[PDB]
Design a protein around this ligand. Structure first.
Ligand SMILES: CCCCCCCCCCCCCCCCCC(=O)OC[C@H](COP(=O)([O-])OCC(O)COP(=O)([O-])OC[C@@H](COC(=O)CCCCCCCCCCCCCCCCC)OC(=O)CCCCCCCCCCCCCCCCC)OC(=O)CCCCCCCCCCCCCCCCC
Ligand SMILES: CCCCCCCCCCCCCCCCCC(=O)OC[C@H](COP(=O)([O-])OCC(O)COP(=O)([O-])OC[C@@H](COC(=O)CCCCCCCCCCCCCCCCC)OC(=O)CCCCCCCCCCCCCCCCC)OC(=O)CCCCCCCCCCCCCCCCC
Ligand SMILES: CCCCCCCCCCCCCCCCCC(=O)OC[C@H](COP(=O)([O-])OCC[N+](C)(C)C)OC(=O)CCCCCCCCCCCCCCCCC
Ligand SMILES: CCCCCCCCCCCCCCCCCC(=O)OC[C@H](COP(=O)([O-])OCC[N+](C)(C)C)OC(=O)CCCCCCCCCCCCCCCCC
Ligand SMILES: CCCCCCCCCCCCCCCCCC(=O)OC[C@H](COP(=O)([O-])OCC[N+](C)(C)C)OC(=O)CCCCCCCCCCCCCCCCC
Ligand SMILES: CCCCCCCCCCCCCCCCCC(=O)OC[C@H](COP(=O)([O-])OCC[N+](C)(C)C)OC(=O)CCCCCCCCCCCCCCCCC
Ligand SMILES: CCCCCCCCCCCCCCCCCC(=O)OC[C@H](COP(=O)([O-])OCC[N+](C)(C)C)OC(=O)CCCCCCCCCCCCCCCCC
Ligand SMILES: CCCCCCCCCCCCCCCCCC(=O)OC[C@H](COP(=O)([O-])OCC[N+](C)(C)C)OC(=O)CCCCCCCCCCCCCCCCC
Ligand SMILES: CCCCCCCCCCCCCCCCCC(=O)OC[C@H](COP(=O)([O-])OCC[N+](C)(C)C)OC(=O)CCCCCCCCCCCCCCCCC
Ligand SMILES: CCCCCCCCCCCCCCCCCC(=O)OC[C@H](COP(=O)([O-])OCC[N+](C)(C)C)OC(=O)CCCCCCCCCCCCCCCCC
Lengths: 49, 35, 99, 101, 187, 59, 209, 50, 66, 318, 41, 115, 50
């Protein structure tokens, strides 16, 4: 539940960041996107391993 | 290791470390030492 | 672990439909890189458990650890200085809210 | 003071070869979009393909056509023996069906 | 048009069968053109699965009584004799699979269906092909076509399975809204 | 490999001495600048196929 | 009898030797007849298939023949024969390994149950070994039939990949632009041939459905 | 055709470069007769004195 | 050992390819190299995004995602 | 390149025969001593092989020439057997050229700018060379035996004093005319290899250097150097085996190392000397072949250019 | 023996394989500073 | 390039997922579907023919292209004898394909608009 | 605990790296359609350095 379900829904099922994602940052508000980052797909081996 | 056996398979586990044609594993495929 | 990892990898590949040949070539290269990077450390761990780990070796490993961390800290400190001295527009008319 | 150290680093040499390959290929693909056409020098690709089996063939001396032919015959006989052994008890099952009846 | 290359000149049997099935399910090809193809497919399957059963007695009566066959039988182990019989039967079965008149007739019927599709939808017949999944064969696609035919011509053509007749709304494509944009992504 | 202890024997004869061998490759070593420049320019036809050709005016 | 200048030019265009070259595709002997049919209205037919990626297939090789022809880049009989040699070595190694792991038919063993491999693993191990042997045999048969077909097409029928032959003939920066041969360059291509190729028109679809 | 080795003659197409100079161009005076005459004259004159 | 041998063979062959292509086969870049790429799925599919050795047999496209 | 040929003029059969005969005659007359030195070096190295190391690995052709000349025969000693050599070469050239020209005329392409592929040309040349070598083998046998007489001990010598005398002695003493074809298979193999390993590399390098440096005059001679080197590399082992077979005396006792055939000679050579033993006198062989090819090509090109100019071909056609 | 030449060729193959292994060990997999420096040069 | 172009078949992408109007789309008029047409590159005055073919010579026949596992670059690679030996003639269309020296001077080095 | 901290660090890093991709919805009134548009970012350099 903690490592696969909640991260999956917070990452893929919504583009809205959580509070703890940016409360310490000073960027303006913006949404996420899984299809405009890491074109090399270097995160697949990381997550799998 | 071609036509001349230098290493001793009796003191090795796998003979495939180096290319050769004169070495055979003591524990061949299908051999399983079991108590 | 295998079930979860394979499922996650396949889902992440499928969501973006990566080119199989190029991505598999890249991931083979990455796998070899990581495997041979960690093989040396595995060899050191397996070899030092008997008749090899002396005072000189222990001091060498301590020095390697501290040197690696120092090398990383050097770049981190350079970037920290850049952050502290980050340039900005003139405070008079171009950017008055910087204050 | 230092203990005996190994005098060869094969994994290191190959790791460096992989590092070089990764650097060149990744830079060319990302910034030049160029991928080497391995088919142009097809004989090096074939060298890799052959090396994928050459050592195992050499172990059993399969460079000899007589050895290859006898190996194929023996393998076919082994396969047919296994299939016959697997499918034989069907006759016994049919025979004992009469006893059951 | 002997020297004219048809659009599907490079398609395999699997691709041709998939194209036929896709056309039938999309209703480009009507149910009145299938029965000959279905009969040919069933005949081809029957012949392919029955050839060895008829061939092995023929080999026993004719080939296995030849001089070399008797030599092998009498001079080599029974296991080797069985291996030789199995090898020759398998070779004959492969030759039949490759050059069956029934298979040729089925391919000819598929060619006729593809010609009909080309006449009906111009050059767009090439749009019926896709990246067929691996291990899905021409026999599987023919079975799927037969299943769809049975479902559409059965008693449950409107109760359990969709009907063959098309009830698509009559609109103008040049003006009707589209679900996808050429370059951007719509909301 | 897995039959010899990792150690250096007392005898000094085990020292690995360098002994000169075949000299043919040193011919290519000596001719390397010629070979390398030929590969760079003539073999790769750099910068183009007309720079090194005998010049002819246009018809 | 012989016609006017236009008829003579048309006859020359249809002549077998007008376009054919010794080191080129023999199809150029009747290229005009083939071109008139395959280039109707001056348009080149796109035989490619439009695929919307869905991960239903990864290698994109339809079959082992396509895998050898395209992925392995074996477009010539020598390459096909070299791949056949590699496959033969692999098949021999696979058969030897199968026999070693299951000593059936060797050492006088006549039953699968008399093998330590069966003792340790049993029917599932036997099934795995049988499947591996069958898979390697299937691949060997496919590559062998591919090599035989390549030999028949090239060595006997003298068929070859003519694009590859042109690549071999021209090693790069070669000055072989001759006005005598129309196919050498675009400019040298006969003007009348371009018009003749697009002589015919397509047929409108019936839209019967 | 004439013996084991064949001297194959091949034709080529037009090619030209931006610059037609600073390469190799045979001088009109560079001929067998003229070069030989000049060389013989110079060599004989030098050798007599030597 | 299978993994080790595969890795070593691949490394040697790729290194040889890199050296040979970068030292001898730079005269004809078009003949020596193939052009390919793949972009983010948010943007429209790149023209060079296709399976190499099958560009004469298939055309690849995909639906954009957010 | 398949249409880069310019076969706008083709010589007649009589012209080809006469020109080839004359040019090969003068070429053989010029380059015979090198072949003599090469054969003597091969004979003297037979059964021993190269035993020097590094730069000295091989037999010095200059040393062999000086040793031969010191015998007191002057330059006339290097032309011993020249009559037999010339007769054999002329017969071989006549047969090979006739067969090659007939086949080429039968199977030539219609277009003037197209020529048969190098593969087919090599096939035809190899067939013609093998046939000619088989037909004219005895002359080569007699010439090689005469050359090796000096190297061999007097008791082992044959003492031939002309082509006809040697042929008669071989036919009578050894018994039957079949003895005249000793080494015929080796000669056929050597001829085939030499025919197939010359025309390919020459065109290869000539076209490549033309592409590199454009149209120059040194291209032909550079290509000739390359082709001669590679032809020597490919053919020298077969020539050595042929020389050994020819030098094999009829009586087994006379032979220092008796051979039963081509394969037997190759096996004996490998056993008694390394694989390098096939390349004794390589420098002499290379010099001989290069000089022969250069003189032949030069004379043939000059005469053909003159004939084309008389006919009236354009400058580029020539 | 009927395969003396074959025995010589087998010796040559063994020598070549041993030389390959020796070269790989001494110049490719080696960690000797002098050899590394020579390769660097 | 037209072979590499993908927008040509973009119209089929929508119907690959929405079959409802696929038949209506098929019932349209075929103009350039699965076909390539190259506009005239040379002025031709032949009243006999109302259309001329300018397809690449190497791309003329598909029977050899289908089984060739290479990109369609051989057709475009050095197939025309025409050349211009002038210094002012540009050799690279993109004027930004350069380097800022070994000093990496910005913004020339660090902006894609220039390098 | 290390896995939890790794997840938090990855989430923050993903947010930071995704900042630079400015994606917005623009409403075309003529077509009455929302379209997704991508653009670069302009901000204080201290944010980029951190
Ligand atoms: C009385 C009333 C009766 C009413 C009827 C009903 C009731 C009665 C009983 C009914 C029983 C039904 C049984 C159904 C299953 C069997 C039939 C079937 O489905 O066939 C599959 C197959 C399905 O194809 P299809 O859909 O019909 O399409 C055919 C089309 O024409 C075009 O297709 P294609 O040819 O292009 O495609 C060929 C093939 C594409 O090729 C492949 O993909 C095959 C790759 C190699 C597979 C190797 C497997 C090993 C066994 C090989 C065969 C036996 C050994 C042969 C030895 C030959 C040399 C002697 O496609 C496939 O079939 C794909 C299947 C892939 C799935 C494989 C499953 C796993 C296999 C491995 C198992 C072990 C390891 C894993 C274990 C896991 C456990 C959890 O059938 C065939 O078409 C085969 C035709 C005949 C070929 C014969 C070739 C020579 C071998 C036979 C002669 C020698 C025999 C020696 C032994 C004799 C004693 C036993
Ligand atoms: C381990 C090796 C690994 C591979 C590398 C290879 C290295 C090799 C060297 C080192 C090793 C040792 C050698 C091993 C050899 C093994 C092969 C073998 O068996 O060859 C022996 C074979 C024969 O050697 P031999 O057994 O010693 O016998 C030769 C003697 O010199 C023959 O004695 P002779 O010279 O005194 O000849 C007298 C002449 C006596 O004359 C006769 O033939 C007498 C009977 C006919 C009389 C009539 C003639 C015609 C005239 C009358 C016509 C009718 C009347 C017309 C009208 C009237 C006017 C005439 O006889 C002949 O003509 C020839 C003998 C046969 C006569 C019987 C009838 C034949 C009929 C068919 C042919 C007909 C045409 C022949 C002429 C050619 C066409 C013009 O030699 C070769 O094959 C040469 C070497 C190999 C060549 C192929 C390349 C293989 C390697 C490729 C590269 C591989 C690289 C990768 C590694 C691969 C590893 C596996
Ligand atoms: C490497 C470690 C040892 C050496 C230490 C020193 C290394 C220092 C390296 C940095 C030096 C300074 C330069 C900084 C460069 C930064 C570049 C950058 O931002 O690129 C990032 C890039 C993104 O770059 P990008 O280019 O795609 O950025 C997109 C921005 N636009 C669109 C504008 C181009 O990301 C990656 O590299 C991918 C990282 C993936 C990490 C995956 C972690 C998974 C965690 C799983 C566990 C958590 C729970 C969930 C488990 C689920 C299991 C199913
Ligand atoms: C100093 C020369 C001898 C060096 C010996 C040691 C090194 C090994 C040999 C290297 C090559 C030597 C040059 C000749 C062959 C060049 C082949 C080549 O690829 O060039 C094509 C290249 C260009 O070819 P290209 O451009 O048509 O295509 C090459 C291939 N692609 C398509 C991939 C680009 O041409 C040149 O660079 C011109 C070379 C002219 C050389 C003239 C002098 C030498 C000729 C006489 C040699 C006689 C002895 C035999 C050779 C030496 C002993 C074996
Ligand atoms: C970073 C990751 C790196 C991964 C690198 C590997 C990438 C993939 C490389 C693939 C190479 C093989 C050839 C690819 C092209 C295939 C072409 C083709 O049509 O197929 C040819 C052949 C089939 O021959 P075919 O060509 O006749 O088949 C197609 C024809 N029809 C449509 C009729 C079927 O298949 C193969 O080559 C692969 C066969 C399977 C190989 C399995 C090996 C492992 C053994 C089994 C393990 C257990 C599995 C359990 C599964 C359980 C399921 C529930
Ligand atoms: C009618 C009256 C008007 C005048 C008529 C003509 C006068 C007579 C002319 C006779 C021929 C003269 C030339 C003979 C050959 C060269 C000189 C000589 O002695 O050589 C004999 C040499 C022999 O010299 P030798 O070394 O054997 O001499 C005897 C040596 N001792 C004393 C140790 C015994 O050659 C031969 O006789 C054999 C080979 C002849 C055939 C091959 C010739 C190859 C070379 C041809 C090209 C040109 C060579 C000359 C080059 C330099 C001059 C341009
Ligand atoms: C394990 C050992 C087994 C040994 C026995 C079984 C295997 C035998 C294999 C034989 C291979 C023969 C290869 C021939 C050479 C081809 C080389 C090649 O392609 O080179 C590139 C070139 C290709 O040239 P090209 O024509 O394509 O054009 C070259 C120019 N470009 C590159 C621009 C296209 O071919 C040659 O140069 C070959 C020339 C020689 C051809 C003739 C060969 C000998 C034929 C003998 C016929 C019979 C004679 C009489 C016999 C009488 C007794 C029976
Ligand atoms: C630009 C790049 C392309 C270049 C193209 C141009 C040509 C390139 C040529 C490259 C090869 C060069 C070879 C040089 C040969 C040696 C020269 C020399 O002087 O050395 C002589 C030496 C010694 O020759 P020797 O043995 O005759 O020595 C004689 C010794 N005495 C004097 C005592 C009689 O040769 C060698 O030591 C061996 C040389 C060959 C090495 C071959 C290595 C590969 C072997 C693969 C075998 C695979 C078998 C598979 C089957 C199964 C096996 C179980
Ligand atoms: C590598 C893959 C191939 C398969 C595996 C390997 C098996 C084959 C291994 C062969 C190794 C080399 C053997 C020959 C060694 C010669 C050494 C040497 O130079 O000796 C001194 C000899 C001495 O000759 P010399 O007597 O003229 O001496 C002159 C020097 N002085 C004056 C100082 C004495 O030198 C030469 O001849 C130099 C040239 C040698 C050329 C060797 C070529 C060998 C080719 C064999 C196969 C046929 C060609 C095929 C390819 C080309 C045609 C297509
Ligand atoms: C209910 C009673 C029956 C028995 C219950 C058995 C207990 C089961 C405990 C499961 C622990 C799972 C650990 C997951 C680690 C990875 C977390 C991660 O990546 O974050 C994702 C998510 C967080 O994703 P997030 O991005 O939404 O983070 C939210 C951040 N804050 C809190 C600021 C809002 O994890 C969680 O939601 C909570 C993670 C807590 C990790 C604590 C680790 C140490 C303690 C573990 C529990 C020990 C209990 C022992 C038994 C006691 C019994 C009384």
């Amino acid at each position: 539940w903690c490592a696969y379900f909640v991260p999956y829904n917070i990452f893929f099922k919504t583009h809205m960041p959580l509070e703890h994602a940016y409360d310490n940052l000073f960027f303006p508000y913006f949404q996420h996107t899984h299809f405009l980052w890491d074109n090399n797909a270097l995160h697949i081996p990381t997550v799998g391993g | 290791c071609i036509y001349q056996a230098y290493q001793n398979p009796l003191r090795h586990i796998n003979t495939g470390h180096n290319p050769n044609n004169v070495y055979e594993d003591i524990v061949m495929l299908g051999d399983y030492p079991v108590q | 672990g295998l079930l979860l990892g394979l499922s996650s990898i396949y889902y992440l590949m499928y969501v973006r439909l990566l080119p199989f040949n190029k991505i598999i070539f890249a991931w083979i290269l990455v796998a070899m890189f990581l495997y041979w990077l960690l093989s040396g450390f595995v060899f050191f761990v397996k070899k030092y458990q008997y008749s090899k780990f002396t005072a000189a070796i222990q001091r060498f490993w301590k020095r390697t650890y501290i040197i690696f961390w120092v090398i990383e800290a050097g770049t981190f400190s350079v970037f920290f200085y850049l952050t502290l001295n980050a340039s900005s527009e003139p405070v008079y008319m171009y950017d008055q809210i910087k204050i | 003071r230092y203990s005996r150290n190994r005098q060869t680093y094969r994994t290191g040499a190959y790791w460096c070869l992989y590092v070089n390959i990764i650097a060149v290929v990744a830079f060319y693909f990302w910034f030049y979009k160029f991928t080497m056409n391995f088919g142009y020098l097809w004989w090096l690709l074939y060298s890799l393909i052959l090396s994928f089996f050459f050592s195992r063939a050499l172990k059993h001396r399969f460079y000899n056509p007589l050895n290859v032919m006898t190996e194929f015959k023996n393998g076919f006989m082994w396969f047919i023996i296994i299939l016959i052994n697997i499918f034989k008890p069907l006759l016994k099952l049919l025979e004992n069906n009469y006893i059951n009846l | 048009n002997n020297l004219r290359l048809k659009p599907w000149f490079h398609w395999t049997d699997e691709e041709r069968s998939h194209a036929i099935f896709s056309a039938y399910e999309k209703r480009i090809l009507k149910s009145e053109d299938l029965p000959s193809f279905l009969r040919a497919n069933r005949i081809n399957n029957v012949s392919t699965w029955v050839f060895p059963l008829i061939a092995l007695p023929l080999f026993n009566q004719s080939i296995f009584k030849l001089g070399f066959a008797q030599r092998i039988l009498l001079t080599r182990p029974a296991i080797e004799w069985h291996c030789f019989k199995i090898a020759t039967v398998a070779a004959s079965w492969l030759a039949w699979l490759n050059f069956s008149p029934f298979y040729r007739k089925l391919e000819n019927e598929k060619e006729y269906l593809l010609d009909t599709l080309e006449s009906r939808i111009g050059i767009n017949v090439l749009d019926l092909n896709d990246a067929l999944p691996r291990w899905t064969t021409s026999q599987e696609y023919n079975r799927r076509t037969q299943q769809l035919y049975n479902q559409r011509n059965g008693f449950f053509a409107g109760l359990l399975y969709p009907q063959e007749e098309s009830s698509r709304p009559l609109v103008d494509i040049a003006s009707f809204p589209k679900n996808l944009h050429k370059e951007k992504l719509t909301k | 490999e897995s039959e010899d202890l990792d150690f250096q024997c007392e005898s000094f004869k085990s020292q690995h001495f360098r002994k000169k061998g075949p000299i043919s490759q040193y011919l290519i070593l000596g001719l390397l600048p010629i070979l390398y420049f030929g590969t760079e320019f003539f073999y790769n036809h750099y910068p183009d196929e007309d720079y090194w050709r005998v010049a002819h005016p246009p018809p | 009898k012989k016609g006017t200048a236009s008829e003579e030019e048309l006859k020359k265009l249809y002549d077998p030797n007008t376009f054919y070259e010794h080191g080129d595709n023999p199809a150029f002997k009747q290229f005009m007849n083939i071109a008139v049919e395959n280039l109707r209205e001056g348009k080149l037919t796109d035989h490619r298939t439009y695929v919307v990626d869905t991960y239903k297939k990864w290698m994109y090789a339809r079959n082992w023949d396509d895998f050898l022809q395209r992925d392995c880049k074996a477009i010539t009989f020598p390459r096909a024969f070299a791949l056949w040699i590699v496959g033969t070595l692999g098949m021999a190694t696979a058969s030897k390994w199968c026999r070693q792991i299951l000593p059936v038919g060797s050492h006088g063993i006549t039953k699968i149950s008399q093998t330590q491999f069966f003792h340790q693993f049993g029917p599932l191990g036997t099934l795995g070994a049988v499947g591996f042997y069958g898979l390697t045999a299937y691949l060997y048969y496919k590559t062998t039939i591919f090599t035989v077909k390549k030999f028949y097409s090239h060595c006997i029928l003298q068929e070859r990949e003519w694009i590859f032959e042109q690549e071999r003939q021209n090693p790069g920066y070669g000055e072989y632009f001759f006005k005598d041969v129309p196919l050498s360059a675009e400019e040298h291509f006969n003007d009348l041939a371009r018009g003749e190729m697009a002589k015919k028109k397509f047929e409108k679809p019936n839209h019967e459905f | 055709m004439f013996f084991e080795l064949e001297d194959i003659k091949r034709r080529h197409s037009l090619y030209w470069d931006i610059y037609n100079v600073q390469g190799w161009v045979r001088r009109p005076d560079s001929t067998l007769y003229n070069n030989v005459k000049r060389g013989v004259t110079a060599g004989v004159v030098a050798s007599l004195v030597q | 050992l299978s993994f080790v041998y595969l890795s070593y063979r691949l490394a040697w062959v790729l290194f040889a390819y890199v050296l040979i292509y970068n030292h001898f086969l730079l005269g004809d870049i078009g003949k020596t190299f193939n052009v390919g790429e793949w972009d983010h799925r948010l943007k429209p599919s790149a023209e060079r995004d296709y399976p190499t050795r099958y560009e004469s047999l298939y055309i690849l496209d995909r639906t954009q995602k957010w | 390149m398949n249409y880069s040929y310019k076969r706008y003029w083709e010589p007649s059969t009589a012209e080809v025969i006469g020109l080839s005969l004359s040019v090969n005659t003068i070429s053989a007359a010029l380059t015979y001593p090198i072949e003599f030195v090469k054969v003597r070096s091969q004979i003297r190295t037979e059964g021993v092989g190269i035993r020097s190391k590094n730069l000295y690995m091989g037999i010095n052709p200059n040393k062999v020439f000086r040793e031969i000349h010191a015998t007191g025969n002057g330059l006339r000693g290097f032309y011993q057997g020249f009559e037999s050599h010339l007769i054999g070469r002329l017969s071989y050239l006549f047969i090979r050229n006739l067969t090659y020209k007939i086949i080429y005329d039968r199977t030539k392409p219609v277009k003037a700018h197209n020529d048969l592929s190098h593969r087919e040309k090599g096939v035809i040349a190899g067939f013609a060379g093998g046939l000619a070598a088989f037909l004219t083998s005895p002359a080569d046998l007699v010439n090689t035996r005469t050359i090796a007489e000096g190297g061999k001990p007097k008791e082992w010598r044959w003492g031939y004093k002309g082509l006809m005398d040697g042929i008669n002695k071989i036919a009578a003493t050894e018994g039957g005319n079949a003895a005249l074809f000793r080494g015929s298979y080796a000669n056929v193999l050597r001829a085939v290899i030499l025919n197939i390993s010359l025309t390919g590399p020459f065109d290869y390098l000539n076209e490549k250097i033309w592409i590199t440096f454009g149209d120059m005059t040194w291209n032909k001679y550079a290509a000739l150097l390359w082709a001669s080197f590679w032809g020597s590399v490919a053919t020298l082992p077969f020539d050595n085996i042929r020389t050994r077979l020819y030098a094999q005396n009829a009586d087994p006792t006379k032979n220092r190392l008796t051979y039963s055939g081509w394969a037997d000679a190759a096996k004996k050579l490998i056993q008694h000397e390394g694989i390098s033993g096939f390349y004794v006198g390589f420098y002499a062989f290379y010099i001989r072949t290069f000089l022969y090819a250069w003189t032949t090509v030069f004379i043939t090109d000059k005469i053909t250019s003159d004939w084309k100019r008389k006919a009236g071909l354009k400058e580029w056609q020539i | 023996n009927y395969f003396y030449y074959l025995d010589r060729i087998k010796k040559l193959f063994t020598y070549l394989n041993d030389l390959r292994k020796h070269i790989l060990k001494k110049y490719v997999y080696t960690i000797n500073h002098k050899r590394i420096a020579i390769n660097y040069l | 390039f037209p072979f590499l172009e993908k927008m040509k078949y973009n119209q089929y992408k929508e119907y690959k997922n929405d079959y409802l109007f696929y038949l209506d789309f098929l019932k349209k008029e075929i103009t350039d579907d699965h076909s390539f047409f190259w506009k005239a590159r040379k002025v031709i005055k032949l009243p006999q023919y109302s259309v001329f073919s300018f397809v690449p010579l190497k791309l003329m026949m598909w029977k050899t292209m289908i089984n060739y596992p290479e990109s369609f670059w051989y057709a475009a690679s050095r197939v025309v004898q025409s050349r211009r030996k002038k210094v002012f003639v540009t050799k690279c269309s993109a004027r930004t394909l350069t380097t800022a020296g070994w000093t990496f001077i910005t913004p020339f080095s660090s902006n894609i608009k220039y390098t | 605990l290390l896995l939890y901290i790794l997840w938090l660090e990855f989430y923050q890093f993903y947010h930071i790296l995704s900042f630079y991709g400015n994606i917005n919805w623009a409403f075309d009134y003529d077509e009455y359609i929302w379209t997704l548009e991508l653009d670069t970012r302009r901000t204080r350099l201290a944010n980029n350095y951190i």
